Amino acid sequence: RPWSEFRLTPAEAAAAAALAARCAQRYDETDGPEFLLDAPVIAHELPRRLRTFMARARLDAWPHALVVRGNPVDDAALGSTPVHWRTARTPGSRPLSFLLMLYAGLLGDVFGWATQQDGRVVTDVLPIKGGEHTLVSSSSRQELGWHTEDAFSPYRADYVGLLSLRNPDGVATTLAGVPLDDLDERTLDVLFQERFLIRPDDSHLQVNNSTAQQGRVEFEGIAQAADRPEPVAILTGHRAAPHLRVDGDFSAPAEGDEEAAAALGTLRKLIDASLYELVLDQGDVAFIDNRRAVHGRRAFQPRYDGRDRWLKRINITRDLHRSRKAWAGDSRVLGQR
Amino acid sequence: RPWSEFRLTPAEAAAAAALAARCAQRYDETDGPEFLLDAPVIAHELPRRLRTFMARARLDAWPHALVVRGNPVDDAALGSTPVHWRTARTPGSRPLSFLLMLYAGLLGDVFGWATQQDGRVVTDVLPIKGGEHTLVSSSSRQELGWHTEDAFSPYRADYVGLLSLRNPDGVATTLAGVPLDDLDERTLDVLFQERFLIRPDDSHLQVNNSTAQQGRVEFEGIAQAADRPEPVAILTGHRAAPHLRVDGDFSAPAEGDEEAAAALGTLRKLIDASLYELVLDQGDVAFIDNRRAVHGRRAFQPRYDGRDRWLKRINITRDLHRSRKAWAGDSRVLGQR
């Protein structure tokens, strides 16, 4: 497969769950300063074979994601899928939120955005009634188009963690790498040049955060990024294994640049053609390499009966200090005037 | 102090030493692929209080270095200081080399250069007879001028680890941060612009590596960087806490750019004025933040009697994949044609 996969034994899965439950019993919340600081060290107590996989798989040159299968989730204990992310920090999902953060701590520094889901570090992906055909992760009936997470920002995550709390109908996450087998060298050259506009996605809009959140200054920076985007490259680094920065619905060529436009149009077609599926079943966790791959989610018919698909999500950077300009006044929650 | 300091208790120091000895007994060498992959996970077995310090101190906004005091070193067991780095992998220094790598594994991904000390990851700092007045770390009588480690390279370390095997006369390492209390905004503006040349230092020259090393292709990239340096900025990131990229002996203004020259001249004067001393006594380890601080070493009279000052050194990056263009054919040893 194009991702690296690990399956917990029942004993390993139970041990990780017990550790997460212990943390949930000793800390007030996942996003509190105390657990944010302690989690990477507590994560050292996770099963050795899992720690070995995470340390090595992160250093491999090829995988689009690190996938860990086999975390038990009891639907009765978990309770119904929340109707909105606002009310999604349910007691039943609490230990799994701690588990996600522990796993994330093995890969890097977790963080959130001042302008997304009220500045939470652990966020929620679930269908919101009335928001089926939006461009945000709470969509359903409309496919979530492929994207680099927070592509607009130089402080975007290196890894995006997704823990499936439930996914009864097996809705697929989509993934694609750089279509290096099909990009001609001229097109590749153009994609490496600063000739593209990438605007913030709709999750950073005031309407998709709680009221009175909301007037906070960090939405100014989002407005600037949308109104006056600076030209940037889509590809960076090594020509034989480039890093990728693009969003199918929020990228554009630089104004009047038809060669750049042609390169982007070609890239869209090649990514559409090479897009593949990863189904995160209940208890599966994926850490998507946000530099090597774009990701999305297939269209699905939401249930709205209390058993809708539901993920916990977390943004991870290899170096928090890279984003210090955007340390709102925290750190761990990013944004700018 | 401007650095963050931790002192091992005798029990903690002994436990860390036992772990390093265990590793030395089970692995053939520190730089072998096996220990490079395993060290970050084995490091999870280090004393908890040390792991907590390393996880937290790395995330603080202020320190120029992380300093760990109190590792025992027995001079009788260590043996005489080597006459050259080539012959410096002595049985007596072996466990301490493993210890350094374990500590480094808590902070990030270790790596070396194809063009420095024969591509070794764990390197040596000791005085070489005849090389007293050189610009390299084996100098003595001539002060080692302040510098960002490998300032010429975009793949330079985030942290530089220095473990003092011996330092009988207490020779000081020098450190300085960005002189933010004295840089006027115009000068600061200019330092943030791509108007400076930074060439590779003399440690990357063929003459300072073993013969037949030496014709290898990576020296071509070093020649290109020296002959045709691309203009780069000295300061990056947040204006209120910038990252620093400069070398007192290998930096220059862009050709004919007198405003840039004035800014560099001013910076030299301010760094010279704010330079301070850190003495790494026997058994002390420092991890210098290579983005926040420049460092050097005071002039000293070498002994050449077998008890000269001697450090083990290691380069650390928060993300190895940042340098994939320069993965010679390894990774862990960097360089380019």
Ligand SMILES: NC(=[NH2+])NCCC[C@H](N)C(=O)O
């Ligand atoms: N092409 C897109 N739909 N981009 C936006 C992706 C979803 C966005 N990151 C969110 O959490 O809502």
Ligand SMILES: NC(=[NH2+])NCCC[C@H](N)C(=O)O
């Ligand atoms: N200004 C300088 N002397 N720069 C070079 C610093 C020493 C070099 N990094 C070495 O290990 O030899």
Ligand SMILES: [Fe+2]
């Ligand atoms: Fe996403």
Ligand SMILES: [Fe+2]
């Ligand atoms: Fe140095």
